[PDB]
Design an enzyme around this catalytic site. Structure first.
Site, mmCIF file in Angstrom:
data_model
loop_
_atom_site.group_PDB
_atom_site.id
_atom_site.type_symbol
_atom_site.label_atom_id
_atom_site.label_comp_id
_atom_site.label_asym_id
_atom_site.label_seq_id
_atom_site.Cartn_x
_atom_site.Cartn_y
_atom_site.Cartn_z
ATOM 1 N N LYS B 211 -14.723 62.384 14.613
ATOM 2 C CA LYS B 211 -14.421 62.898 15.947
ATOM 3 C C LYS B 211 -12.944 62.711 16.308
ATOM 4 O O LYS B 211 -12.280 63.663 16.723
ATOM 5 C CB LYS B 211 -15.336 62.265 17.004
ATOM 6 C CG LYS B 211 -15.145 62.835 18.401
ATOM 7 C CD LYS B 211 -16.163 62.298 19.389
ATOM 8 C CE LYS B 211 -15.903 62.857 20.783
ATOM 9 N NZ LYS B 211 -16.915 62.367 21.759
ATOM 10 N N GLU B 217 -11.771 53.474 8.267
ATOM 11 C CA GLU B 217 -12.593 53.626 7.069
ATOM 12 C C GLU B 217 -12.550 55.060 6.554
ATOM 13 O O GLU B 217 -12.357 55.292 5.363
ATOM 14 C CB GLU B 217 -14.043 53.201 7.332
ATOM 15 C CG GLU B 217 -14.214 51.725 7.670
ATOM 16 C CD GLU B 217 -14.379 51.480 9.155
ATOM 17 O OE1 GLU B 217 -15.254 50.662 9.514
ATOM 18 O OE2 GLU B 217 -13.643 52.099 9.958
ATOM 19 N N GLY B 272 -20.610 60.882 19.207
ATOM 20 C CA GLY B 272 -20.786 60.750 17.767
ATOM 21 C C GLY B 272 -22.240 60.623 17.345
ATOM 22 O O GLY B 272 -22.704 61.298 16.418
ATOM 23 N N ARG B 273 -22.973 59.757 18.039
ATOM 24 C CA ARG B 273 -24.377 59.517 17.722
ATOM 25 C C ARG B 273 -25.313 60.636 18.207
ATOM 26 O O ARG B 273 -26.539 60.528 18.066
ATOM 27 C CB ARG B 273 -24.817 58.151 18.258
ATOM 28 C CG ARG B 273 -24.685 57.988 19.756
ATOM 29 C CD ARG B 273 -24.856 56.558 20.221
ATOM 30 N NE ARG B 273 -24.537 56.403 21.638
ATOM 31 C CZ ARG B 273 -23.339 56.065 22.106
ATOM 32 N NH1 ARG B 273 -22.328 55.826 21.278
ATOM 33 N NH2 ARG B 273 -23.153 55.961 23.414
ATOM 34 N N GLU B 358 -26.546 51.766 20.123
ATOM 35 C CA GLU B 358 -25.189 52.042 20.588
ATOM 36 C C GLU B 358 -25.183 52.690 21.974
ATOM 37 O O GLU B 358 -24.226 52.530 22.740
ATOM 38 C CB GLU B 358 -24.399 52.887 19.587
ATOM 39 C CG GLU B 358 -22.897 52.808 19.809
ATOM 40 C CD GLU B 358 -22.104 53.486 18.720
ATOM 41 O OE1 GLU B 358 -22.157 54.726 18.643
ATOM 42 O OE2 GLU B 358 -21.432 52.772 17.942
ATOM 43 N N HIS B 389 -46.241 46.966 3.097
ATOM 44 C CA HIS B 389 -46.388 45.909 2.092
ATOM 45 C C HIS B 389 -45.242 44.894 2.099
ATOM 46 O O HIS B 389 -45.130 44.055 1.193
ATOM 47 C CB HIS B 389 -46.528 46.524 0.695
ATOM 48 C CG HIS B 389 -47.650 47.507 0.580
ATOM 49 N ND1 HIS B 389 -48.963 47.168 0.817
ATOM 50 C CD2 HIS B 389 -47.651 48.824 0.267
ATOM 51 C CE1 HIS B 389 -49.728 48.230 0.644
ATOM 52 N NE2 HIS B 389 -48.956 49.249 0.314
ATOM 53 N N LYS B 519 -12.179 46.083 16.073
ATOM 54 C CA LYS B 519 -11.115 46.903 15.489
ATOM 55 C C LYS B 519 -9.753 46.248 15.686
ATOM 56 O O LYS B 519 -8.943 46.200 14.761
ATOM 57 C CB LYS B 519 -11.102 48.310 16.090
ATOM 58 C CG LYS B 519 -12.297 49.172 15.716
ATOM 59 C CD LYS B 519 -12.183 50.544 16.351
ATOM 60 C CE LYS B 519 -13.449 51.357 16.140
ATOM 61 N NZ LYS B 519 -13.364 52.660 16.858
#
Lengths: 557, 557
Positions: B211, B217, B272-273, B358, B389, B519
């Site tokens: 965005k 990263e 973003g999400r 978030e 399981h 950050k």
């Protein structure tokens, strides 16, 4: 009440928490004591790398740690540990020994069950695994058309899946010269179908992981694999070239078409969720080689010895367990996050969901009394740094207290661009726990808003949103490199953490009676789904869901 | 205090819970009322399949549901929803609209921000995506040596990663003919290194998804990919054939060296999400085709219309939200488990970790008041039967109350063995919620042990361990088939659930200030890692961990 809540050391701890825990502030603890890191961390030298367990960013003082250690002692942790290691039948509801430690007992010191040393049989199976690994990896073991094996497919559920999957993922760099490995676990037909689609029957070998060799989902998947195989091979005698068993059921294994020589045995004192160290780890040994598998065992053995020999106050799994007790039974935290800053470790949290939650998700004590306190937490997590962009918002600024273990290797397996990526990864690893501890004060945030050119009105409105309360506790576990040895030590460390917590709660970490009801009810529903007849045998929700299934399954979209 | 706790309808609900909740017993509720399923479920006909939302196995009565709906009305849910849909700037800390609903607005009815319809630009970018997908998938788009593209690599993190990854995984059967898709997200060099090892620069197309186009990263990974590419191509003009960008930041995209004709734009009102519906979904459209992407959007649009037009009492996302409020704010449950019985949906829970946590992991309200109540839960889970399981032992017999959503398609994408696998999968889906609801009484367990031939001593010892307390609430969400359309509807349903909860808590579901501090602190630590000198600039833990890194990074292992 129950054993834990009737314990006077626990009562003292709870009373102290009630009176004093509000005074515990991480920022203040560090400011008051420059020796805090030195006094609240363990730098373990394994001779094959170091493991630093830094528990200093926890809401604990010297006095709290002393009280916690005293509680471990008065709950019988030392005696219980020795009983596990000696082959005592500490799985009391099933009357079984608990001897995953025997599987990796590299010293070969006798460990007796019913007066008989288990080590010769442990080593016999390991020798068989080594021989099989040589045959397959060298290319000498041929498929039905005479070709070398290129793909290994492990078919198993739960304890027969999660360990081998997690470990082969974590140790991927050590798999040169090994066959590709695939894991089929879900009964959902998607899992086996998408796996088989990318395979040749000529060069694929299936490992069927099931002690009884009657496990429904595993055997169904196994039978689907065999059907697929026989469509190509058209010869029942060829099954023995492409199917092996991790089992003790000789008759059922032979019935399937597997050569009984290729049945790799394990024992009732090997719990499924503690089984990767046994024959169940065959796919690991095939993938990374038997030498690396022995290194994995050796790392676990190192940690076993650490656990066995070390005074509780400096004993890594014990301290991790005690911090967990503090957060669970005093603070009331439901969850525990595992956050490895390592893509290879992407299945580490999922593994310990079973290891922890199936072990300690319990409510009946040894006496038969119901607990009147919390037991095992919900374990969860994703690798860093990804989590920072997913859910750390909630960890930093939500309304939950969430103990987190941050894990990272100092040395990366891929030091690309002169180590730039790993430098950034490490920086984030360090910054996140620092941030969680320190937060950001109003005076700090205010200056940032002013520098950003915010109006007095906008600054006033935004200020509380920009503040980080901090005081959020973490463990940092840092290790030289994620080698087979170090990974073995790390897994064993958490195994023993879980053991210690179980003893303190007075529960059985080693049974799993809670899986029975779901199994019973599924067996009843299975035959009811066939055909068009209405199902009325259950509650109205179950009936209604079945009605929907029957109505919707023929609709063409 | 805060808006929710000051609300009289909430205090009434809480008081009712205190006085009456202990009398809610699921087994008895179902026995007393044959119409329970009918009264507490929604069978939604989308005209492209049905979605059954069965909430009958919840700890609720008609009275509880009435109070919850009244609370939603009192908290202004309908007005807030209308404001979102109309382009009002409801993201109040950032002064932004919240318009993921515009991205999938198939009706093309104008939605205005700052007096200007956003639909022309939404549709312009969709048209660009369609054209690009045709060119790549047909083989017409050629790499720098003149070969068709075989591999697509999405580089992005968080909102620019999780959606496209989850959706391409869930819709894998719809990807025949499309290029292979890869996701690189972690800064951990392992991620890009292992991806690039399997690729040729001649036939690989990189999609840089961000965005802001400034995320460390993503830009670092993108630069690493570009360096790898240019080492082979040795021509900067070739970058235009192999790199595209999905962003809101034209300037930074240009700065990186990507052609503006290779930029797929989105807007500040796309969180973003909540971004997979935008240009960020390009990897989805490339993998499964633009037609299937349009179906995904259309499914979301259907659910948007459901949310917008349906009375609250029959409104699926509203009811799911309210049940969540009941468990979070009255029962105090920390977590919410998402358990899809579908291997293709294996990343669904991880996606909603960001989507939910978030969004609603917040602590400051619209009035500026700190919350004095719980907000967003910790979301977790694994697909059935795999999660089954691993950790269901704790769900059945631990000390935690865990609301679970169980999800399954009626029709499988792989009806192998004449439907045998799916029959077993469905049976387990149904049995588990039945088991959680019903439990097993001491007298029922006693009879079973009696029938097993257990001695009085052995029976009494084992009895309490075999008891299931039950009364554990679930939702069952069952749908005709997991098509692109139905998946779109399901994702949108949870988006709106999250919205409703946020409005009721009086928080901003659409900002994420909690990611900033980490950050900032990482930027400070980065250069400190260089060189052999000791760092003393932080707390002793951060300092000590840095010392460990510096001491351990040169050891040969």
């Amino acid at each position: 009440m129950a054993a834990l809540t009737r314990n006077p050391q626990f009562q003292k701890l709870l009373e102290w928490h009630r009176a004093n825990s509000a005074n515990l502030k991480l920022r203040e603890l560090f400011e008051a004591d420059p020796e805090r890191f030195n006094n609240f961390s363990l730098n373990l030298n394994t001779n094959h790398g170091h493991i630093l367990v830094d528990y200093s960013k926890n809401l604990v003082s010297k006095e709290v740690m002393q009280m916690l250690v005293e509680l471990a002692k008065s709950r019988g942790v030392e005696a219980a540990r020795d009983n596990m290691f000696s082959g005592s039948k500490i799985n009391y509801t099933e009357d079984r020994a608990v001897l995953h430690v025997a599987l990796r007992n590299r010293s070969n010191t006798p460990i007796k069950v019913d007066g008989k040393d288990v080590m010769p049989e442990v080593n016999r199976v390991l020798d068989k695994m080594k021989s099989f690994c040589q045959r397959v990896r060298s290319g000498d073991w041929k498929g039905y058309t005479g070709k070398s094996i290129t793909d290994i497919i492990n078919i198993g559920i739960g304890g027969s899946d999660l360990g081998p999957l997690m470990v082969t993922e974590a140790l991927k760099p050590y798999s040169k010269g090994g066959p590709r490995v695939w894991f089929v676990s879900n009964i959902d037909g998607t899992h086996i179908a998408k796996t088989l689609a990318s395979l040749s029957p000529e060069t694929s070998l299936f490992i069927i992981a099931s002690k009884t060799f009657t496990t429904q989902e595993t055997i169904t998947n196994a039978e689907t694999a065999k059907e697929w195989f026989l469509e190509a091979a058209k010869d029942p005698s060829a099954v023995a070239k492409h199917f092996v068993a991790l089992s003790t059921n000789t008759a059922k294994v032979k019935e399937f078409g597997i050569d009984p020589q290729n049945m790799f045995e394990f024992w009732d004192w090997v719990g499924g969720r503690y089984s990767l160290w046994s024959a169940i780890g065959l796919s690991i040994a095939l993938h990374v080689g038997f030498d690396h598998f022995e290194q994995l065992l050796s790392g676990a053995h190192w940690m076993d010895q650490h656990f066995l020999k070390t005074p509780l106050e400096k004993n890594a799994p014990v301290l991790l367990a005690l911090l967990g007790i503090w957060y669970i039974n005093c603070y009331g935290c439901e969850t525990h996050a595992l956050l490895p800053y390592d893509q290879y470790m992407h299945r580490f949290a999922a593994y310990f969901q079973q290891g922890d939650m199936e072990s300690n998700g319990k409510y009946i004590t040894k006496s038969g009394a119901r607990v009147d306190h919390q037991t095992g937490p919900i374990v969860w997590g994703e690798p860093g740094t990804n989590g920072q962009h997913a859910f750390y918002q909630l960890i930093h600024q939500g309304t939950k207290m969430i103990p987190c273990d941050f894990l990272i290797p100092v040395q990366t397996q891929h030091p690309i661009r002169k180590g730039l990526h790993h430098k950034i990864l490490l920086a984030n690893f360090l910054a996140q726990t620092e941030a969680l501890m320190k937060g950001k004060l109003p005076e700090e945030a205010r200056k940032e808003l002013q520098a950003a050119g915010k109006s007095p009105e906008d600054l006033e409105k935004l200020l509380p949103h920009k503040v980080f309360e901090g005081n959020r506790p973490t463990n940092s576990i840092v290790f030289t490199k994620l080698t087979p040895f170090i990974l073995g030590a790390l897994i064993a460390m958490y195994e023993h953490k879980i053991f210690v917590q179980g003893i303190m709660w007075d529960i059985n970490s080693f049974d799993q009676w809670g899986v029975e009801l779901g199994k019973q009810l599924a067996k009843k529903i299975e035959p009811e789904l066939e055909g068009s007849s209405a199902v009325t045998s259950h509650d109205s929700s179950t009936n209604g869901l079945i009605s929907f299934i029957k109505q919707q399954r023929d609709t063409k979209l």
